[PDB]
């Protein structure tokens with residue numbers, strides 16, 4: 281248990297670090313998607329010709345679906361780096377056993393990537409290149425082989441997750457809660473992780489009540505989204521395994537390679 | 543928003559109905575498991591054969607040992623489906639939902655509730671059966687042949703973790719209601735009154751846990767995290783059923799009963 285003044289302090293600390301760690305916030309993403317601006321408008325990629333212009337406008341040689349896939353891997357690697365930097369700011373995290381720090385990151389980064397990818401998404405597509413571009417859901421769904429099925433589950437989650445109307449100050453605490461999960465396989469000291477997560481959960485609960493006072497049981501509704509998050513991470517790895525069987529000419533970043541091994 | 547007095551009334555209503563619907567409560571099961579008439583113990587092949595003679599099993603039809611135990615699990619699950627169906631009728635609002643939505647919620651909810659309530663009957667060493675007259679050891683179940691041994695052990699693995707929350711029957715009655723009223727089941731026609739009821743049930747669960755476990759910080763949050771897991775475990779479960787129903791190729795009528 282924490283005094284509410286301490287829970288607010290924790291929320292502000294976490295929101296402050298999130299702003300420092302993640303260059304493209306949900307608030308900026310919404311300003312870009314929601315228009316009414318001329319200085320923030322993205323170039324829209326919806327087909328092969330517009331993709332080819334995007335290389336000139338927004339600014340590898342292989343099949344289109346490969347190039348896009350590789351682009352995502354590059355950005356996922358960046359997200360892992362941003363997420364790693366943020367986790368170190370979570371009070372208590374860097375004091376955990378070093379093996380547990382690694383373990384929490386390995387199983388946590390993908391659930392967080394999907395969570396924050398939703399910020400960049402609406403039902404028609406997703407922001408890319410730090411919001412300079414926007415690639416349509418339709419174009420992603422039409423990519424060949426297994427690559428077309430890759431992107432769409434992300435979109436089905438995002439439309440549902442986005443209906444919660446969370447802002448960055450909410451997401452910063454939620455993301456912290458995800459990292460400090462005591463049920464990750466192979467954890468050596470579950471209890472101090474659970475202790476940190478209890479404080480974070482208290483902070484999330486008070487934050488959601490203050491920031492969405494008319495939004496009954498939003499706390500419980502947000503935690504249920506773990507279900508959706510878990511399900512997509514599993515579909516994602518199962519699709520990766522197919523690609524690792526069909527496209528043996530293709531390599532993953534060492535960081536992603538290590539995250540997925542077991 | 544609901545007044546706290548209304549939430550307590552809801553909690554009491556659900557507890558009373560849960561007591562009526564389910565033969566073996568968690569409180570009774572714990573009395574048995576903790577040794578506080580000893581149940582007949584099945585720990586190997588010879589005691590299984592005597593337990594079938596001694597206990598009056600209702601599932602013994604004109605097979606291999608691991609099969610017979612599996613069919614026992616099926617027989618009891620079909621029983622639980624009807625007990626859970628009857629309980630749902632008592633959840634305020636449930637019977638006024640669209641009839642297809644009532645069916646849809648039960649169809650996707652019973653498996654999660656069966657796993658949840660199976661934990662009440664389990665400890666790290668085995669499981670109560672036949673309304674607590676029997677006890678089958680975890681070790682004997684874990685050691686069954688082909689995939690059957692790997693079928694039973696996940697139930698125990700979940701139950702040991704779920705039981706560490708130390709919920710009692712009055713907590714579980716509201717929790718079970720929350721699972722049934724899940725507005726994200728596929729094929730639902732009118733989600734809004736379902737989420738509205740679940741919102742009331744969630745409010746009631748939160749107050750129940752705070753009053754009944756005042757020292758158990760964020761237990762509400764921890765229990766909701768367990769609903770999450772249940773989804774993944776049930777999916778692992780059905781996929782295993784599909785394999786057993788495919789690789790271990792009785793009567794077509796029996797096949798229909800257990801569809």
Ligand SMILES: Cc1ccc(COc2cc(C(=O)O)ccc2-c2nn(C(=O)c3c(Cl)cccc3C(F)(F)F)c3ccc(Cl)cc23)cc1
Nearest residue numbers: 348349351352353355356359393397406408409430431434
């Ligand atoms: C050309 C081009 C297209 C889109 C982007 C934007 O992509 C992302 C941006 C961010 C961000 O800016 O924070 C964060 C995550 C992604 C993203 N990760 N991701 C995956 O899970 C993934 C991973 Cl981990 C490893 C290997 C392969 C994949 C992937 F094949 F599935 F892609 C996505 C899947 C679909 C979509 Cl639409 C986005 C992502 C940049 C450049």
Ligand SMILES: Cc1ccc(COc2cc(C(=O)O)ccc2-c2nn(C(=O)c3c(Cl)cccc3C(F)(F)F)c3ccc(Cl)cc23)cc1
Nearest residue numbers: 611614615616618619622653656657659660669671694697
């Ligand atoms: C010989 C013998 C052994 C044990 C029992 C007691 O079993 C149960 C009792 C109850 C109860 O009394 O509330 C409730 C569920 C089970 C039980 N279901 N079950 C399943 O696989 C299952 C589940 Cl989880 C959900 C849906 C459908 C099924 C099933 F159709 F596939 F069966 C088990 C697996 C292992 C164990 Cl150890 C117990 C169960 C009786 C007789």
